[PDB]
Design a binder for this molecule. Structure first.
Ligand SMILES: CCC(=O)Nc1cc(Nc2cc(NC3CC3)n3ncc(C#N)c3n2)c(F)cc1N1CCC[C@H](NC)C1
Length: 331
């Protein structure tokens, strides 16, 4: 079979907790009053939810309501517990309340409102410093949630809300997040395609927090190279090909070998043979002001096939790329 794997850090954190911390199916839900919230306007939809701006009529606070479509109650309980567990943590969205929508008898999660700048307009004006700053802020959230035994599993631009005016960032959408347990085999059908770690694409199920760091790598790549998304595959197979054409097939094959991964026979024809490319080839006059030796060192150490060898969020936070950010935060 496949070779087992444990997280390098925060390995046993959930084991040393009370059962109720991670055994979310046990979580009883205390419903708030649905009439405290009046829907203003629709903000977006998804396969499994519809998102609205609403006003909390009690205190006139703006709020964001995620009316869930029919999903497994298990997964509702799971998102709620994770949000409750993470409440107050750095750059983590606050779950303000939970109500039973009248026009669907469905659960609706009520969230803090972030006055978010649109990721099209923002990822164009971002200076080198801004990218470093906001990457540092994201890492605070990833390290915190990972230290609390949870993996987001859907890190990507659209799940990061940024109020540029107030230099304030919230990692949102915890609906795919899960508790890390050593030895557990997780679903690979998570995350969005351009952000899927190799482990997902080759069906290595015994993955961990390091998954989030791959996704962060993908984000960083696109920000510094001004290519959204950076690995732009047509499907899960081609996605791994896109990666392979950059990271090379040599390390991919070493990776499948190390963990004795059974590789879908599909892949055997389309992966081919590819050198690992030097990041300089993605550098052009238009983007160079964002690319630096530091940025490339940091990126290289996020984007690794072998999940065990990627930076941990805390290691990432210690990288030279953030030195000016860290000094400025202490002043
Ligand atoms: C809570 C909503 C969720 O988890 N995801 C989601 C959020 C938004 N919009 C915003 C927009 C703002 N502020 C801007 C108006 C000024 N804020 N502030 C806070 C929060 C939160 N949380 C949020 N969310 C969206 F437009 C689509 C989705 N999606 C799209 C992908 C699928 C997903 N559910 C599975 C729903």
């Amino acid at each position: 079979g496949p070779v087992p794997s444990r997280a390098r850090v925060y390995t046993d954190v959930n084991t040393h907790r009370p059962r109720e911390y991670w055994d979310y199916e046990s979580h009883v839900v205390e419903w708030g009053n649905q009439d405290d919230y009046q829907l203003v306007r629709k903000l977006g939809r998804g396969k499994y939810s519809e998102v609205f701006e609403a006003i909390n009529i009690t205190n006139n606070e703006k709020v964001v309501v995620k009316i869930l479509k029919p999903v497994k109650k298990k997964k509702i309980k799971r998102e709620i517990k994770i949000l409750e567990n993470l409440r107050g943590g750095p750059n983590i969205i606050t779950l303000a309340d939970i109500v039973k929508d009248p026009v669907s008898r469905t659960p609706a999660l009520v969230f803090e409102h972030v006055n978010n700048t649109d990721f099209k307009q923002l990822y164009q004006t971002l200076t080198d410093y801004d990218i470093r700053f906001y990457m540092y802020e994201i890492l605070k959230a990833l390290d915190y949630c990972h230290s609390m035994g949870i993996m987001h599993r859907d890190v990507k631009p659209h799940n990061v809300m940024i109020d540029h005016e107030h230099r304030k960032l919230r990692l949102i959408d915890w609906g795919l997040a899960e508790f890390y347990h050593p030895g557990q085999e997780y679903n690979v059908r998570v995350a969005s395609r351009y952000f899927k770690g190799p482990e997902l694409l080759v069906d290595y199920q015994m993955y961990d927090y390091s998954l989030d760091m791959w996704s962060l790598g993908c984000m960083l790549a696109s920000m510094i190279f001004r290519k959204e998304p950076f690995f732009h595959g047509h499907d899960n197979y081609d996605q791994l090909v896109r990666i392979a054409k950059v990271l090379g097939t040599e390390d991919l094959y070493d990776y499948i070998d190390k963990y004795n991964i059974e590789l879908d026979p599909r892949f055997n024809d389309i992966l081919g043979r590819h050198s690992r490319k030097r990041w300089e080839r993605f550098v052009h006059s238009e983007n160079q002001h964002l690319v630096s030796p530091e940025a490339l060192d940091f990126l290289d150490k996020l984007l690794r096939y072998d999940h065990q060898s990627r930076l941990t969020a805390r290691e990432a936070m210690e990288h030279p790329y953030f030195y000016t950010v860290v000094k400025d935060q202490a002043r």
